[PDB]
Design a protein around this nucleic acid. Structure first.
Ligand SMILES: [Ca+2]
Ligand SMILES: [Ca+2]
Ligand SMILES: [Ca+2]
Ligand SMILES: [Ca+2]
Lengths: 220, 226
DNA sequence: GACG
DNA sequence: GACG
């Protein structure tokens, strides 16, 4: 049963941030990669080769100046720091960023579904909190979201760690590239979604839920 | 030299793919922008090795890459060189070059420290005049009327003299780096290659960009519409 | 030239 | 768990 129709585009998403949830983190880097459903509908060996990302894709990767310092932990793994984001003149998560995101979304055929790894616990609530600071009305209040951890559990079971890298090494037998660059993680995430692309699309269509319903991570 | 319009804060590496070459009145099918602060080009390290290693992209970069359905068919050479076609672009539901696309570019650019300079290989003969006709077609004011632009062929020509060759993108790349470009089909692959070469002597490339920047609004359109 |  |  399809609660909101076929999702016409999938937007792979990854945030880098200042820290883990209980630090009440702020976003330092955001990457979206937008793929039409038909790119999966047209995506084999043991192991199969890492799938070739579709030719037709839209991509946005942005570095964002946070309002507070990165935790030592986050700085090391991301290679980002408030101090360097500022030296290099990055703007905060502001009203202009929300226009950018709206315009990027408006270029995708609707409905759209955000896809993030640990998205329900991490990227979705965090993104919600960032947006709630703005009171520009949120550009995501019409979009849908789903967690790729739950997706890949269902796929493998129909076919142990569900961390991005563990799944990727299990399917493909390679270490992933560019850990904790947001674009690098979005890539790695695409590759596992392209593992069984028809069944993944099916699952996403089954499980998409309104992003307006996602509770903020904190602040509320 | 004294600076035409002072120090350019952002360098935005730019590449377009399209349906063909200038005489065909081509339409844009893909666009990539990679924005970097000038500081990341005062921060590229000393190259150690032989052959010289391809430089690391800066960490802090903004990237936009978009596919664009053109209103006319891709020529055979453009299909082969880009792996894109109109039929396929429409199947993947890509929108035309429209007013929203301009709002997106404007917000992207407005996210940048000002002034910004567009950098594109053969930009003065291809990418800049083409971008101008695409924007002139819209009912949106041009998001690029305060943006500057510079051609990287003239940069690397002057850079390489300072240290009869081809100056096409991958020739410079393979000459500097002794390997083939990682990706020569996509707009993002060409920006990444242009970024690599522009990181060859980043101190001198900056010096040169600041001296040669011109308003994008003085860029004449590739072709009129009427 | 060199850009698609 | 798993996300910075
Ligand atoms: Ca992540
Ligand atoms: Ca990450
Ligand atoms: Ca080019
Ligand atoms: Ca190109």
């Amino acid at each position: 049963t399809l609660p909101h129709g076929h999702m016409q585009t999938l937007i792979f998403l990854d945030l880098e941030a200042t820290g883990l949830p209980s630090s009440r983190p702020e976003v330092t880097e955001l990457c979206l990669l937008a793929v039409h459903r038909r790119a999966l509908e047209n995506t084999q060996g043991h192991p199969p080769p890492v799938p070739r990302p579709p030719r037709v894709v839209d991509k946005l990767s942005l570095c964002i100046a946070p309002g507070k310092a990165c935790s030592p932990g986050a700085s090391e793994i991301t290679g980002l720091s408030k101090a360097e984001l500022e030296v290099q003149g990055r703007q905060r998560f502001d009203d202009n960023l929300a226009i950018l995101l709206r315009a990027f979304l408006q270029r995708q055929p609707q409905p759209c579904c955000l896809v993030a790894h640990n998205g329900d616990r991490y990227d979705f609530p965090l993104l919600q909190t960032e947006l709630a600071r703005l009171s520009t009305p949120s550009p995501l209040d019409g979009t849908f979201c789903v967690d790729s951890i739950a997706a890949l559990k269902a796929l493998e079971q129909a076919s142990k760690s569900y961390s991005l890298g563990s799944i990727y090494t299990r399917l493909y037998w390679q270490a992933p590239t560019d850990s904790h660059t947001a674009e690098g993680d979005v890539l790695t995430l695409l590759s596992i979604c392209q593992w069984k692309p028809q069944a993944l699309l099916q699952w996403v269509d089954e499980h998409a839920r309104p992003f307006s319903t996602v509770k903020p991570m904190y602040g509320t």
